[PDB]
Amino acid sequence: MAGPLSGLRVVELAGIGPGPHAAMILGDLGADVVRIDRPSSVDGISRDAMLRNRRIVTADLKSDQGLELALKLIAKADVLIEGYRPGVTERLGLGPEECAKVNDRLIYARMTGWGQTGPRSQQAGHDINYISLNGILHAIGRGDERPVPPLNLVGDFGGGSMFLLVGILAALWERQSSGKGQVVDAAMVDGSSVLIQMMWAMRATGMWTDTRGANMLDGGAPYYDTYECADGRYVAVGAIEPQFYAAMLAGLGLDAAELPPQNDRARWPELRALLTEAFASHDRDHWGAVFANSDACVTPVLAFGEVHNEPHIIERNTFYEANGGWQPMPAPRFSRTASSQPRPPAATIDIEAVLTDWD
Amino acid sequence: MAGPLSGLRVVELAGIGPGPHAAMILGDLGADVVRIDRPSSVDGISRDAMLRNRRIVTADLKSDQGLELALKLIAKADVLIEGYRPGVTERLGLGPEECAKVNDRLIYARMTGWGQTGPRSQQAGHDINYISLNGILHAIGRGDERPVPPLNLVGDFGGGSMFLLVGILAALWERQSSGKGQVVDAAMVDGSSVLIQMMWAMRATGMWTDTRGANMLDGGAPYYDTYECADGRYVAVGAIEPQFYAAMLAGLGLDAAELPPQNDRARWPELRALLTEAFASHDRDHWGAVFANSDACVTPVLAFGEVHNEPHIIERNTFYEANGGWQPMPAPRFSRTASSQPRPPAATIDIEAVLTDWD
Ligand SMILES: CCCCCCCC[C@H](C)C(=O)SCCNC(=O)CCNC(=O)[C@H](O)C(C)(C)COP(=O)(O)OP(=O)(O)OC[C@@H]1O[C@@H](n2cnc3c(N)ncnc32)[C@H](O)[C@@H]1OP(=O)(O)O
Ligand SMILES: CCCCCCCC[C@H](C)C(=O)SCCNC(=O)CCNC(=O)[C@H](O)C(C)(C)COP(=O)(O)OP(=O)(O)OC[C@@H]1O[C@@H](n2cnc3c(N)ncnc32)[C@H](O)[C@@H]1OP(=O)(O)O
């Protein structure tokens, strides 16, 4: 099995969102990932590419046989991932304390939104709820309109699965000293707050306000935003540094002497109107050409469907093809122990066959 | 130093955005992190709270002495982080190969937007550019308007710093069984693509379109969006599962029989109009109360400055007071080897002092 996490063994209690995303990535990087799902719900080989790099098994954990098979897998494994509400694995017989008795080397990884304790810890929720409570959602969107969710990128993945991964892997490094595992408490409300640490930093020093759409990186700055082109498609402009901004102006045909200063915020309305008219005068692909190989920080805003035609995406093999859709190749990349193409979802496997293989 | 990464040694070549964020999290979890900045820019004690849990040193990497000193640090370290454009560390003579001469164990971590090679590899960029090329930016915002950047959470951090971290820690695991370091190539355009794997999976199975504002999780669904309240503040609604959706309807005062189906997408506009009027009839805190302890998936949308006053936030200590204001405490959390509160940014110490300390 290719990749730097070769040999690493993982048990995943099937759930939704961050849990499986973390499990995917471990698998992506070479880990041996085994996923226990309900029989209650499996109808052949899965169509969810998020379940790649997996062996799937079925098991009613409510039954006593279920429980004990599961407990055998765990005993032979380096990591457990579960993302149910607090108390669920306890009441199944699969809690940290019950796991610590069949394998004190276990990394016990708990993926929630709200955390393991406190008033909201039993409330159902999704991405949008967790980022609503810690200031993030309020900051996203135009100023004249209600906040807009950044899909489920910030709570589920950036501030969720990825902090679960850091926790698992940080704990594996600890386990090299002490010889013992431990419990990783990954909550989306905490992870996403560390994910946005920069704004908390800038806020402290007066470089960020609570007003939506009036900051350097939220769309309020005319040099960090998208612009509609002549064809109704878009470019992105990220020309923060004055040298890059100058390069942008020259490619737009605008003379700096006729525009307000880049960072004169009181004249951002004028500046925006000027840039808006210039970008509107040609189509996205024109600007893409004009600015390729420049430091102007102007790129075309591509739709998912067009990504596979972009030279730089093609050439670094950022995507692979599989079942009527492209999918991302593993990230990041390793010089010596490279990951390989992900193995698709495979039909289910008997939990015995796995206990055998793991010997 | 408290945390699972006690006695990991990390050398950070100073940059902006992802590299410092990764370095911060490593520090947060108890790593020994030394940041080499240029003397050109160090004036006082640094007021960027992202520079917490660091020792700062200066060193002209272009002088002979600066280079030699840096290479002695790197020889005594486990991980090196650099976030310059490709070729830059090579020309300083701090490239992977020079580092492997003084330390075949080093994890060499390279943080870029576009990657190490390919047509855009030398192009300046920021977050908004990286996410423009791979379909992410196009998918965020309302459908009747131009895309809106989700701050710099998705390229710099979620698809950026966090993938650098998963790369550093997976390589440390691989090292324990091979004796050898390697090079981690973390490109924001790759990481952010994996971060958004759920949408690629969903588009593959016909459950996501390239139309902005027309999807389950992009704000197009009336049960997954924000709503403005009587006071001009907002709630977030995330009631995907029908039973959570039904609980929300009951709390709004809405008889399910008069509404269109939850998931009849052709009637979503009509459904949104009915929910809009309901939510508009009371203020945000009213709904926060009504739905406390509920599975309705309804939460108040808090601005940064309100977050310190929310019970679930206080009681889990997600933030600590510092500096000007609040900062996120480390994430995720560890049962046995727990992180401690971050140390505020050092004063510049001398690179020899560090060297004698590390001997
Ligand atoms: C249309 C559906 C698909 C929606 C797709 C959405 C994906 C993305 C979206 C934007 C997110 O943001 S995804 C993150 C949600 N939050 C969390 O994941 C954080 C923490 N977990 C939760 O809050 C809950 O899991 C959640 C609200 C997601 C679901 O609640 P639930 O349905 O009440 O499940 P809960 O976790 O409380 O417990 C269910 C358990 O099922 C039983 N048992 C598990 N595995 C097995 C098995 N193999 N065999 C038998 N039973 C199994 C447990 O016994 C338990 O049931 P019980 O409490 O009734 O005893
Ligand atoms: C917080 C404060 C303000 C932050 C403003 C924005 C914050 C967030 C924003 C939204 C982002 O998205 S941040 C991510 C940007 N992209 C990358 O980080 C991707 C990779 N790097 C780049 O593409 C470039 O670094 C970038 C475009 C960011 C800037 O280009 P550059 O200024 O030309 O720098 P480059 O990397 O090309 O090389 C600069 C180097 O400086 C010299 N030397 C470094 N350390 C030292 C030293 N200790 N002593 C002396 N000189 C030093 C290097 O020699 C090199 O210079 P050279 O090629 O002129 O020889």
Residue numbers in the entry:
A (entry chain A), B (entry chain B): 1 to 359
Sentences from the paper on this structure:
The 2-methyldecanoyl-CoA 6 side-chain group is a straight-chain group and electron density covered C8, C7, C6 but no density was observed (except in active site H) for the terminal carbons C5, C4, C3, C2, C1 due to conformational heterogeneity (bottom right). Clear electron density for the thioester carbonyl and Cα-Me groups in the ibuprofenoyl-CoA 1 and S-2-methyldecanoyl-CoA 6 complexes shows a cis conformation. The thioester oxygen forms hydrogen bonds with Asp127, Asp156, and His126. In 2-methylacyl-CoA structures, Fo–Fc maps did not favor R- or S-epimers; both were refined with full occupancy. The Cα-H of each epimer points toward His126 or Asp156, resulting in distinct rotations around the Cα atom. Ibuprofenoyl-CoA 1 and analogs and 2-methyldecanoyl-CoA 6 were relatively potent inhibitors, with ibuprofenoyl-CoA 1 displaying the highest levels of potency (pIC50 = 5.05 ± 0.05; mean ± SEM, n = 3). Our results are consistent with a different mechanism in which the side-chain is held in a relatively static position with the different stereochemical configurations accommodated by a subtle clockwise or anticlockwise rotation of the α-carbon. The crystal structures for ibuprofenoyl-CoA 1, other 2-APA-CoA substrates 2-5, and 2-methyldecanoyl-CoA 6 demonstrate that this mechanism applies to all these substrates. We therefore performed a similar analysis for ibuprofenoyl-CoA 1 and analogs, and 2-methyldecanoyl-CoA 6. This analysis showed that potency was negatively correlated with LogP for these compounds, that is potency was decreased with increasing LogP values.
